[PDB]
Structure formats: structure tokens, C-alpha cells
Design an enzyme around this catalytic site. Sequence first.
Site, PDB file in Angstrom:
ATOM      1  N   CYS A  43       0.816  -1.206   0.000  1.00 22.97           N
ATOM      2  CA  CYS A  43       0.000   0.000   0.000  1.00 22.97           C
ATOM      3  C   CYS A  43       0.852   1.259   0.000  1.00 22.97           C
ATOM      4  O   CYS A  43       1.564   1.571   0.981  1.00 22.97           O
ATOM      5  CB  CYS A  43      -0.998  -0.043   1.205  1.00 22.97           C
ATOM      6  N   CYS A  46      -0.037   3.937   2.779  1.00 24.59           N
ATOM      7  CA  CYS A  46       0.344   3.366   4.103  1.00 24.59           C
ATOM      8  C   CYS A  46       1.859   3.576   4.348  1.00 24.59           C
ATOM      9  O   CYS A  46       2.330   3.976   5.461  1.00 24.59           O
ATOM     10  CB  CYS A  46       0.035   1.832   4.181  1.00 24.59           C
TER      11      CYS A  46
END
Length: 122
Positions: A43, A46
Site C-alpha cells: 500500500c 500506508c
Amino acid sequence: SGRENLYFQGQSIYIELKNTGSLNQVFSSQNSSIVIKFGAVWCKPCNKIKEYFKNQLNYYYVTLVDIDVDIHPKLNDQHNIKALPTFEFYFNLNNEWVLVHTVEGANQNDIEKAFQKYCLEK
């Protein structure tokens, strides 16, 4: 049976959670504020805020928990996570843990506003 690695700055704590069962144990304690970040290795947003999140130990009295949703899919589903990253802000109020705010996404300005509102600055 499990191992966890705790990183301390004073009484603030950061943990990158290894075992799903250790989460209940983190909550079994001295910091009124626990903040959980749900994210994933692949991600992009993230990863963009991962260092910002761990460095919050220097600025807040807080216990920070990092949760890879692909290691802890049960916790992902139980906390009803809908976007990555997601931040959950908990506060101990009247001897009970209360989920007081959630932030989705990696906008650092918004996350910082949440820490300022829902966490305890050093």
C-alpha cells in the site's frame, strides 16, 4: 506463545504487531491514548505515513500499534476496515477503552489534527 518488540520513548510505546492475540494484552495496560494504524506492505499511502506514525512517540504520550492487515486479517474484519491506511484513536475513559475517532487515508495534516484533538501532546 508469542514475541513482541516494544520501542519506548519515555512512557510512549510503538509496536509493530506480530501476533493478533497480543493486541488484547497491549490494551491490558499507563497511556490513556492508544492509536492503531491499519496498513499493508504493498500500500503506497500506508508507506508514505509509516515513519510519521512511528515518530509520534517523540511528540505524544501514546501507545502506537502498527497492524499489517495481511498478517492480521481477523483484526481487519473485526474493526471493519474499509480503506488503507486507517487510524483508530482509543482513549481510556471511566476504566473502559473507547474508540473516540477514526481517520482514513494518509493526509498528514488531517492525521495531525486528530492526534492534537484525541491524543495527549508531550
